[PDB]
Write a protein that binds this ligand. Structure first.
Ligand SMILES: *[C@H](O)[C@H](C[C@@H]1CCNC1=O)NC(=O)[C@@H]1CC2(CCCC2)CN1C(=O)OCc1ccccc1
Ligand SMILES: *[C@H](O)[C@H](C[C@@H]1CCNC1=O)NC(=O)[C@@H]1CC2(CCCC2)CN1C(=O)OCc1ccccc1
Lengths: 306, 306
């Protein structure tokens, strides 16, 4: 028992991280087979970072303008292209440590592990959610761009995030590995802002089931609710709507605990209306929304990866 | 910016995990050079787990009673010995993936990353503290024994914990890698219990400095306190005493923020006496004590490992 914000083991991704330098800019790249993926803002200069024209900026570059370092071994670039907001650096050596992998574009509400990196060297790993407003509340400093977010399914690394920038509220924005930003953000230093966020309702409910699986029961009640009536309360506390789909995904956890999904919605309603009154759930004094129903089942069941 | 419960990259440890089977018991071992380290309770039977005599139990074993699997490759045991509560299985093959490593026995209050494993296969990584009462609040199921806790310093893995058991409150107990339990616990199924825990004061203060570094300032005040007077308040809220040593370790963070250590103790006092009054610090509605001063500096500065 116990319940922790668990990240995936990071070894398969660590073996893929490299340093990319262009001009006076250094950041991280992701080396898979003979291609290095990194944010295209690496070709930006400190002068045109307000409204850069990246096609224009890239056609001026040569392969040798890109310094790629994998450990203490220099990778030679033999080609470059840009796909949306990511640069693809073709190198003459395929990464022998390339795991089985996929690129996936996740939905808001989904979680992933971030391997934070500086100078192509990993600093730490932590678990994130894609917020409903398409930011992530990460931990990123200067130099962390090109660090990736990912999930693992048995032996396969699904890459889902690459870090590009920090917004004025201190939250973070980035792209999928094909370079499409999550949310309305753009890779120029303009007046963007996160947009109103909401709490991921289906995840809160998952975490309440995690609590029950682990012996916290104090928040349960005998009442129930309809899905419509629950969503009327959710709206007013800035929770996102719960769909019949969400109810269905919560099926297994409902079945394991014996607590109908709508019954747990009724507990969530009372928690929203009364607060927690000095008590904690799974070591938290807030309702936690960065565990998906899948995350809860994986951790409470002991699923491994290889 | 941002502040997350960050674990060390787990790749160096993943390459060391193996499965150890003895009789009807399977758990994890740690393969470093030609030795596999695992909990000695692997030789226990479901009959004598109340008061087992492990010397007696071990002298009855042969090498071939131990099945060690590294991936899908069987490791042959050519010798065994017991050191305190860990078994050392000598195998005929040195782990080519052996990192540079040390064994260290940590003090309560110190943090480490846990690579949770089942059947020699990693499940997840998360950050822990050694509680003052020498338990850890982990996430461990059947089969997780032999999962290790660790820190990394540049290129060197310092192993500090190996998981052995779960206590009736759902918290966890284990040993250092030389098999000495942390705390008064013993590897038999008797009437042990965790003992009263306390909050790690120096770590709470570190995390308040993390908050200031990241822009949370609402909890600061103009007052100050003496170390004695602070500790009078700490005692009553079940915080452990703050020593001049702790004050000294908090030096760098004090210097970076411009907030004297005793000034931040005065904020902590008011937080203890008034609660947080609906506000959060670094996304938490509780005072967080599982970040050491070192953890804060590492994350807010961007230190990497290689
Ligand atoms: C890549 O290493 C950084 C990561 C930032 C630095 C602070 N925290 C982070 O996550 N990315 C950027 O600095 C990014 C590059 C930029 C150039 C043109 C388009 C994108 C501007 N930018 C950015 O995040 O600007 C906002 C910012 C900058 C510094 C500090 C806070 C916020
Ligand atoms: C090793 O895989 C397990 C890990 C436990 C299982 C539940 N959560 C965990 O962390 N260790 C044990 O089961 C451990 C072995 C034992 C045999 C003789 C000495 C030690 C008994 N024991 C243990 O933790 O007992 C308490 C317990 C058992 C099952 C469920 C909850 C608590």
């Amino acid at each position: 028992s116990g319940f922790r914000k668990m990240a995936f083991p990071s070894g398969k991704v660590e073996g893929c991280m490299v340093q990319v330098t262009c001009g006076t800019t250094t950041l991280n790249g992701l080396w898979l087979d003979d291609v290095v993926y990194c944010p295209r803002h690496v070709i930006c200069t400190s002068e045109d970072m307000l409204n850069p024209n990246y096609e224009d900026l890239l056609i001026r570059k040569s392969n040798h303008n890109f310094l790629v370092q994998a450990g203490n071994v220099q990778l030679r670039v033999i080609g470059h292209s840009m796909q949306n907001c990511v640069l693809k650096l073709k190198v003459d050596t395929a990464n022998p440590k390339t795991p089985k992998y996929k690129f996936v574009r996740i939905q808001p509400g989904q979680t992933f592990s971030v391997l934070a990196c500086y100078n192509g060297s990993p600093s730490g790993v932590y678990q994130c959610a894609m917020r409903p407003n398409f930011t992530i509340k990460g931990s990123f400093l200067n130099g962390s761009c090109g660090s990736v977010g990912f999930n693992i399914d048995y032996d396969c690394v699904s890459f889902c995030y690459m870090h590009h920038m920090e917004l004025p509220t201190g939250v973070h924005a980035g792209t999928d590995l094909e370079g499409n930003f999550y949310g309305p953000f753009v890779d120029r230093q303009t007046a963007q802002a996160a947009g109103t966020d909401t709490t991921i309702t289906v995840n809160v409910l998952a975490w309440l089931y995690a609590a029950v699986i682990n012996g916290d029961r104090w928040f349960l009640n005998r009442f129930t609710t309809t899905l419509n009536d629950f969503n009327l309360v959710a709206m007013k506390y800035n929770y996102e709507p719960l769909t019949q789909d969400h109810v269905d995904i919560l099926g297994p956890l409902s079945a394991q605990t014996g607590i109908a999904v709508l019954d747990m919605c009724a507990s969530l309603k009372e928690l929203l209306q009364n607060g927690m009154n000095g008590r904690t759930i799974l070591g938290s004094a807030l309702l936690e929304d960065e565990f998906t129903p899948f995350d809860v089942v994986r951790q409470c069941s002991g699923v491994t990866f290889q």
